[PDB]
Each structure stands twice: as structure tokens, then as C-alpha cells.
């Protein structure tokens with residue numbers, strides 16, 4: 345633990361950390377330690393330097409040691425802080441003075457904080473009935489939004505809320521069993537916003553009154569005003585204030601739309617998630633069950649896309665249909681195309697455009713999930729109001745879908761913003777994975793310009809030079825895609841030619857940091873753009889680095 349450290353704050357936010365740093369003066373080398381906001385038992389170090397706050401993720405190693413950016417192992421957070429007081433390996437400056445928790449501030453750790461993870465998990469399971477991987481993938485992407493949502497549930501279902509019990513009943517419930525200091529319950533004093541907070545202190549029960557303001561706010565006599573019992577308990581679990589002590593363990597109760605959340609959409613789960621829905625016996629879909637609309641959604645190098653409708657046993661599924669060119673009809677391409685289509689149909693993840701099946705009719709047809717808001721680059725160019733935090737959320741879902749493709753030994757080959765489609769403004773899906781290989785794309789597609797875009801601008805050096813496509817080269821493309829996202833749909837390597845791009849990269853030169861792009865996101869782009877394939881991270885490391893930054897900045 346880090347609880348004994350007087351400059352350790354527990355699970356506070358990044359902005360609360362920064363507010364403490366300003367409270368302490370903002371002198372260079374002023375620092376504090378806190379908990380990583382990821383349920384991974386890690387830490388975060390917040391440092392003042394040049395009127396700015398610098399945040400670093402401290403991860404727990406398998407052996408129980410600690411390290412920053414896969415670097416030097418340290419025995420404990422205290423040992424890590426001791427080390428960085430004399431040498432800064434990658435840190436902005438050395439650590440000179442700790443900012444101790446102000447008088448009256450305890451670490452934001454404890455039972456209330458501990459319940460959050462199980463509460464979010466339970467909330468997903470009962471709101472969306474998700475299980476296994478669909479459930480895990482929902483929590484990973486949506487943890488910040490889910491944390492906000494559990495804070496709005498009715499206090500009546502909370503373990504520390506005992507309802508209409510009497511003062512004598514509450515006295516007896518708080519006293520029973522081990523007399524842990526801070527053991528508490530909240531009970532209703534009446535139906536009109538009147539409550540009692542019962543707290544255990546040195547074997548005695550303290551009965552505090554919580555009253556509702558004319559303003560609808562809840563507080564104890566002369567104490568801070570809160571909107572909910574959730575906020576009240578959260579604050580009192582680390583700031584004693586009026587109370588003789590912080591709240592600790594709840595007493596056991598007697599007994600024992602273009603803004604929708606990804607899981608609020610039909611496409612989040614596979615159509616065949618319903619056991620009543622019977623999955624086709626192969627990659628082949630029945631042309632008789634498919635109806636296409638006349639108007640095109642768009643087109644590209646490999647074909648034209650239309651909106652369609654696929655008749656299933658218990659519903660009409662809206663689909664997007666890519667009709668391959670005449671070139672795809674060549675008997676020489678058939679086996680490779682069917683082989684890749686089988687592998688594409690195996691992929692099941694919320695953050696990919698699932699390939700439902702194929703139709704060999706008037707032309708070859710790829711039946712896919714609909715992502716109606718269209719491509720990421722065009723959307724951002726048309727909606728510059730989209731916040732940096734919303735962009736982090738979308739690129740993080742892309743990193744999740746890419747980790748899944750990598751785990752599945754699937755190489756995308758054309759990972760770019762044009763191939764990231766939006767279901768909602770908070771829900772991105774990777775499209776056209778492995779299409780260029782399935783269709784045996786020509787040298788003129790890779791080297792030259794097609795539809796106003798230069799595909800080589802997304803290729804790792806070993807792809808252009810040695811034609812070696814791998815999950816590591818997809819990592820490179822992800823860095824270019826991150827740059828596109830942060831540039832609100834701008835084209836990469838402005839006005840350059842493939843020859844000019846290749847030679848620039850050989851020199852170790854890279855694209856610049858987009859306006860308003862965080863330093864840590866530009867550092868991630870630079871890591872993806874590692875020339876050497878062996879030193880370049882895989883998607884597991886990219887997703888975790890992105891996840892950690894996302895959880896630290898969003899709410």
C-alpha cells in the first residue's frame with residue numbers, strides 16, 4: 345500500500361490532483377501520489393513544472409513491483425518517489441517537494457471506493473444483460489460513463505442505506521459484530537428528505553442528522569451541501585469534516601440516437617446473440633432474404649456501398665452492403681476471397697463492423713453491420729465541436745477492436761480514419777479489415793493515389809519496402825489514424841508523395857502534434873511510429889496505454 349505516505353491521496357481525479365498542486369503553490373518539482381483510475385492496483389504521480397501539471401502512470405508488475413512506461417522496476421511507490429528525487433528517467437524534472445494531504449484530508453481509499461467496480465459490473469449485467477466478452481468490452485470502453493451512471497441510482501438499493509429502521513434498531517445494527525471504526529448506515533428519519541447518519545466511533549454509536557434544504561440539498565448541521573446521499577457518503581469516506589471520523593464499512597442490511605452509449609445500440613452485440621436466431625451453416629447468405637436500396641451510401645477502390653435489409657427469423661436487420669467490382673469476379677481470385685471471407689465472418693467484437701455473410705449474386709456482396717454516421721475523418725471535419733475527450737474515447741474503441749483482431753491473428757492492412765465508421769458519436773467500429781488481401785490489391789492501389797487518397801501514408805516502413813503486413817504494421821497505421829482523429833479529419837503528410845513520405849520516415853522525421861492534441865497522445869503516436877518492428881508495441885500495450893490516459897482524463 346501507499347496509505348502510510350502523507351502525500352498519497354488515493355482515488356481522486358486528475359483535476360482534483362491539479363487543484364491540490366495549485367493549492368501547494370505550483371513550484372517546480374512539487375508532487376503528489378494517487379491511485380491509478382483503472383482497477384489494476386497501480387499508482388499515478390502528478391508533478392508541477394513550468395506552470396503545468398505532469399501525470400505519470402505507475403503500473404503494478406506481476407511480482408508486485410512497480411514501474412513507469414515498462415521501465416525500471418521499483419519495490420514500492422515510496423521507493424519509486426525516492427528514486428525520482430535524485431534521477432528522472434523520462435520525467436519532466438526531478439521530484440523535490442511532496443504536497444501532503446491537507447489537514448482534515450484522508451486518502452480516498454476505503455469501502456465506498458472499493459464497491460464501485462462490482463457496482464459498474466452489476467449495472468452492465470442488469471441494464472443490458474451482457475455476459476462474457478461482450479460484458480468485459482462494455483466495461484473497458486465505458487468505465488468513465490458507467491461510473492457517472494451508478495452515482496445516479498436510487499440510494500434505497502445501496503448497501504449503506506437501511507430505509508425506515510428506527511434509531512434503536514440502527515443503534516443495535518451498528519453495534520453488532522466487530523466494532524470497526526467508521527462502520528455506518530444511513531436511514532430515513534421520514535419520507536420528506538430527512539435522514540440519520542449512524543457512525544461507529546470507539547465502540548459508541550454517533551447519530552448525525554442529515555436534512556434537506558429548501559434548495560433540495562442534503563447536509564449535516566453546518567456541513568457541506570450535497571445533491572445526493574451518494575455524494576454525501578463519497579465525501580465523508582475521506583474528509584471527516586463535522587464528523588469525529590471518516591465513514592468506513594457499511595453495516596450489513598438484515599438478511600443474507602446519434603449520442604447513444606454503445607450498448608444502447610442494436611449493433612453492439614452480434615445479431616446472432618439471440619439463441620432464437622439461428623446462425624447460417626456457412627459464410628454464404630441467402631440473396632432472397634436481402635433487399636437493397638437504390639441510393640449509394642458511398643464508394644471506394646473495392647466497390648460501392650448501399651443500405652440494405654436482411655430478413656431474419658425474429659426481425660428485419662438493417663445492413664450496409666459492399667458490392668465488389670467486376671475485377672472481383674475473376675476465377676483467379678475466388679478461393680482467396682472465400683478463404684478471407686470465412687475468417688472475416690469468425691470475428692465477433694463490438695468495435696468492428698461485423699461481417700454477417702456474403703452473397704454471390706449479380707456481383708459479389710459483403711453483408712455488414714450498419715454504421716450510419718459514416719467515416720470518422722468526414723464526421724470530425726463536419727463536427728469540429730466534438731471534444732478531445734470524445735476523440736480519446738473513439739480511438740480507444742479502435743485500439744480495443746485492433747487488440748481483438750491481433751489476438752485473433754487477423755491483420756487489417758488498411759487501418760485509417762476512412763475505415764473507422766461511427767454508429768453513434770460515442771461508438772466507433774473498424775471496417776474493411778483484411779479486404780485488400782481478400783481482393784489481392786494491385787501495386788497501383790498501394791503505391792499510387794485512388795479516390796483522392798494515398799494508401800502508403802498509413803503503411804509502416806517494412807510494408808512499403810518489404811511488403812510485410814503484420815499486426816505490428818497495423819500498429820503503425822493506428823498512429824497515423826490517431827493523428828487524423830486529433831486533426832479533425834485532415835489528410836496526413838499534406839501535399840506529399842509516397843516517395844517523399846518514405847524518405848522523410850527514413851530520416852526519423854515524423855508528423856507534428858495536432859493543434860490541441862495532448863502530449864501523451866502525441867507520445868503514443870510516436871511509439872506507434874517506431875521504425876524497428878521489434879521495438880514497436882503490439883495492440884495489447886497500445887490499448888492499455890490509451891485506456892490508462894482515457895480513464896485518467898475523462899471524469
Ligand SMILES: Nc1ncnc2c1ncn2[C@@H]1O[C@H](COP(=O)(O)OP(=O)(O)NP(=O)(O)O)[C@@H](O)[C@H]1O
Nearest residue numbers: 641642643644645649664712713714715718719762
Ligand atoms: N458498414 C457500413 N455502414 C455504413 N456505411 C458504410 C459501411 N461501409 C462503408 N460505408 C460507407 O461507404 C463509404 C465508402 O466506403 P468504402 O467503399 O469502404 O471506401 P473507403 O474506405 O473510404 N476508401 P477505400 O480504401 O478505397 O475502400 C464510407 O465512407 C461510408 O460512408
Ligand SMILES: [Mg+2]
Nearest residue numbers: 762763775776
Ligand atoms: Mg472502407
